[PDB]
Ligand binder design. Structure first.
Ligand SMILES: Cc1ncsc1COc1ccc2c(c1)N(C(=O)N[C@@]1(CO)CCCNC1)CCO2
Ligand SMILES: Cc1ncsc1COc1ccc2c(c1)N(C(=O)N[C@@]1(CO)CCCNC1)CCO2
Lengths: 619, 37, 165
């Protein structure tokens, strides 16, 4: 009986804006929903705006909901100065904002914080030249954001008010951009605070689950428009497309959706319609025979498109490698004359050109080198070119050195062969298996350590008994009286080598499969994107002929406005549908149909006994 | 206690005997109403 | 400063890394006093390896002191027992080192057979890591089953071997 108790205080006076302020102070939204916001209430100007400000600064969900539901329009409310006041409050629950300020308060500094958090070449709208000159002061529509819900989304995420973030997400335009930007910022702040963190990881998982579901519905409704949503270039969030923001937040589930894989396959085939391997290899091996295939639609040129299909580059960039691993083998299993032969000049040259493209890719400084050295194959590549190089300049000396030269090439041939693996990675079955081989190795290393300990122990014992008089010698190092102990303690070694750990290794490579098989299926479907966006960038010509394209450099989905409005509507139908469908899936379950009918039963029982005493009094 | 009394396994068992108690009271109200008629 | 350091020495992770570098020394010198010639008296590295076993013994007893109940609580687990056997046989070999040739060749024996245990202890030091420790415990548990199937394979092997021979 607390509502009439508060209504006594509400009936104590008549200052209705101060009454609404007090109702915001005691934090009971049902009282203001019941008594204050009624028909005929008088309101001065500026009272609703100040009420909205005081409600936003103090983490009030339902009050801001009801004030938006009662006349307050955010397109006329929010100015640059009041948003600056929102970023400079003092009532926050818990924030890591000032740490990011000191690691990178004016809004330009806030944009620098956002660019530092996302990273890459992300050029936020605060750091443009159109916003910076307008900040010099501190039409009437020059302090109003046309898309203010994006700023309210960013302000919700950066100060960590989660229920406000989930409220601000479900209104306006461009929900998936806000969801992926929120996921990126949550993961970045989680890693930065680790460098609160569990909460930010949970919030990143939340927006991340939500963004995937909207796609599930947007794919469950339609496909042709669905593809448009992922592809269109945002003109607001720093010129990015939703798929690039999906990969740059390292979200393995969004790419794992079927629509993203279909879009990547339509990128992969390029300008063809033949839905492949024998046809595309016959196209290279028979250049006039390309005309029989089927193109797309929006000669003398019908071909140049064929060369830019990335599947073509692939089959003309792996035939060049097959050549390189056959000639390099023939320049090792054969005699070496005092100067190098023709196939050696060609094999030396292919390594030569590969080097210039690999550096040029880095150019397109220490941050760039670190991003290039983030993964392992570039590192292994850097070592390989370097040792096929020391061997290159050791080739050109006399015999003592020449015999050494054979050495490096001899040892250097193993890596090029062991790369083939990667080319085999593309197939839709060998790639998951190759990833598994990679993951199992750690466990191989640990049991190598244990087997090395036991092997060295039994070997030191056996070799120490059977050779008593052996003066200190480098010969002992090269290897590194009652002999009847030597047989018995040999056999027990086999009993703990080929019996116990081998069967431990089989047991630990059998009950680890059920997780790594589920992991690699995700990791392959994610890492196809890096491959597909890699070859648009490598020239058409082969690497032993790429000098023409390199010397020519040294020489010197966009959409319209009406289809954009169609996209904004397609999203609107989906967001509302998701919420409705979630509510209809909720209120049809048993777990609410029981809990409401229990209190319905007890209410009817009490009313029945009151009807009983009334009926006996009337009797 | 709050995790106990919010589960389904009590919300069913109390409302069953609430139902039978209201049914017996309903039939007593029925015979009283016919006598008053 | 002047004291900022003495605290550093009492951090138990320090004692650990200065109490496993002493063991790494002990397993390198003991190997070099077996794969090399033995002169009529012991060499320098043998006096140092004999000595480390000597000091280990006094600390191990002092830990027990700090009577049959105390010895039972100390012998509740296995590594103290295996340790008690090991010092004892690097001891019989210690006092058999100091005789003539027939005995000296026997002396090589005990050291020869005694080096296996110190190596097989390393395991424990490896136990600390947050991944090798669970695995070492597993190796320990699996052994029972190894013993039972050793019994069955011994029965069948001895039968077919007796018939063939
Ligand atoms: C391409 C290329 N560069 C220098 S020589 C040369 C041709 O050698 C091939 C032939 C077939 C291939 C690849 C290379 N692959 C590949 O390059 N993968 C990437 C992209 O560069 C992505 C991340 C793993 N490594 C780099 C993977 C398998 O298919
Ligand atoms: C310590 C010590 N005493 C005599 S020589 C010496 C140094 O040798 C090491 C070096 C690293 C170590 C250990 C010993 N470990 C250890 O001592 N464990 C305990 C505690 O004494 C607990 C229960 C198992 N056994 C005893 C375990 C692994 O880390």
């Amino acid at each position: 009986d607390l509502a009439i108790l508060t209504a006594l205080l509400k009936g104590a006076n008549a200052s209705a804006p101060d009454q609404l302020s007090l109702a915001l102070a005691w934090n009971r939204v049902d009282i203001a929903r019941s008594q204050i916001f009624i028909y005929g209430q008088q309101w001065p100007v500026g009272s609703l705006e100040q009420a909205m400000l005081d409600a936003l600064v103090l983490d009030r969900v339902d009050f801001v909901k009801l004030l938006i539901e009662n006349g307050v329009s955010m397109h006329r409310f929010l100015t640059i100065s009041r948003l600056e006041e929102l970023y400079n409050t003092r009532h926050g629950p818990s924030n890591t904002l000032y740490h990011l300020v000191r690691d990178v308060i004016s809004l330009i500094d806030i944009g620098l914080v956002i660019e530092y958090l996302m990273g890459g070449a992300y050029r936020c709208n605060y750091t443009r030249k159109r916003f910076r000159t307008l900040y010099h002061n501190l039409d009437p529509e020059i302090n109003h954001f046309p898309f203010p819900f994006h700023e309210l989304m960013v302000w919700a995420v950066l100060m960590k008010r989660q229920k406000m973030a989930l409220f601000f997400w479900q209104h306006g335009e461009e929900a998936m951009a806000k969801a992926l930007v929120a996921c990126k910022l949550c993961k970045a702040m989680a890693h930065e605070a680790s460098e609160i963190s569990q909460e930010l990881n949970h919030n990143s998982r939340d927006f991340g689950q939500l963004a995937v579901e909207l796609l599930d519905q947007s794919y469950k409704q339609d496909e042709q428009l669905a593809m448009k949503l992922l592809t269109y270039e945002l003109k607001n969030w720093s010129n990015a497309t939703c798929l690039q923001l999906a990969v740059a937040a390292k979200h393995r589930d969004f790419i794992a959706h079927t629509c993203s894989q279909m879009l990547l396959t339509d990128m992969w085939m390029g300008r063809l319609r033949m839905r492949s391997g024998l046809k595309v290899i016959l196209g290279i091996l028979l250049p006039p025979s390309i005309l029989s295939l089927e193109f797309k639609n929006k000669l003398g040129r019908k071909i140049y498109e064929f060369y830019n299909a990335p599947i073509v580059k692939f089959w003309f960039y792996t035939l060049a490698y097959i050549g390189y691993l056959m000639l390099f083998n023939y320049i090792v299993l054969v005699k070496m004359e005092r100067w190098p032969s023709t196939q050696e000049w060609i094999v030396i040259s292919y390594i030569f050109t590969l080097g210039i493209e690999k550096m040029r890719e880095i150019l397109m400084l220490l941050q760039k080198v670190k991003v290039w050295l983030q993964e392992y194959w570039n590192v292994t590549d850097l070592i390989a070119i370097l040792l096929f190089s020391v061997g290159m300049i050791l080739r050109l000396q006399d015999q003592p050195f020449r015999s050494d030269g054979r050495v490096i090439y001899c040892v250097n041939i193993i890596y090029w062969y062991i790369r083939l693996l990667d080319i085999f990675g593309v197939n839709k079955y060998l790639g998951p298996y190759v990833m598994m081989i990679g993951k199992m190795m750690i466990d191989m290393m640990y049991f190598v350590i244990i087997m090395l300990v036991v092997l060295m122990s039994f070997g030191v014992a056996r070799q120490a008994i059977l050779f008593p008089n052996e003066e200190p010698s480098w010969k002992l190092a090269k290897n590194i009286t009652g002999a009847w102990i030597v047989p018995a303690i040999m056999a027990c070694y086999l009993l703990v080598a080929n019996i116990l750990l081998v069967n431990l290794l089989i047991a630990v490579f059998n009950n680890t499969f059920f997780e790594v098989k589920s992991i690699s299926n995700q990791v392959w479907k994610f890492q196809r994107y890096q491959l597909i966006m890699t070859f648009h960038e490598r020239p058409v010509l082969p690497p032993p002929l790429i000098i023409f394209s390199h010397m020519t450099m040294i020489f010197q989905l966009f959409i319209t406005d009406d289809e954009l409005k169609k996209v904004h509507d397609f999203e609107e139908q989906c967001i509302e549908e998701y919420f409705r469908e979630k509510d209809d899936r909720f209120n049809s379950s048993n777990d609410e149909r029981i809990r409401v009918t229990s209190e319905r039963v007890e209410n009817m029982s009490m009313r029945l006994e009151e009807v009983n005493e009334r009926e006996h009094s009337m009797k």
